[PDB]
């Protein structure tokens, strides 16, 4: 019983894990690169 429970816990944990981090990485990349390309267009204007 320990075996089936522990390993089910590992599975659920890893799924939540990689989901959480791909969320945060995508949001952060979008924001920082968003304003970065904005600064690119602004400096490129002059």
């Amino acid at each position: 019983f320990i075996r089936r429970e522990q390993l089910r816990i590992k599975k659920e944990k890893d799924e939540a894990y990689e989901k959480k981090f791909k969320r945060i990485i995508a949001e952060i990349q979008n924001e920082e690169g968003r304003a970065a390309n904005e600064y690119a267009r602004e400096k490129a204007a002059r």
Binding site: F1, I2, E5, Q6
Partner: protein
């Protein structure tokens, strides 16, 4: 349905080795697995979840 799904359970094909008269299911594997699952949950899982939990209620009444 009991009689005609008989691989719910396990039975010796012999009958009794000796026939005594003084006045067939010898078990239910699925029910044993069920109830053992229930007990193993209600103890071992909550132990695994409160591995290191300090503090409880002591109640004398």
């Amino acid at each position: 349905r009991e009689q005609f799904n008989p691989f719910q359970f396990k039975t010796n094909a012999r009958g009794p080795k000796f026939e005594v008269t003084t006045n067939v299911i010898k078990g239910r594997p699925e029910l044993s697995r069920a109830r053992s699952e229930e007990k193993r949950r209600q103890t071992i899982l909550v132990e695994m979840q409160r591995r290191n939990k300090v503090g409880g209620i002591i109640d004398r009444r």
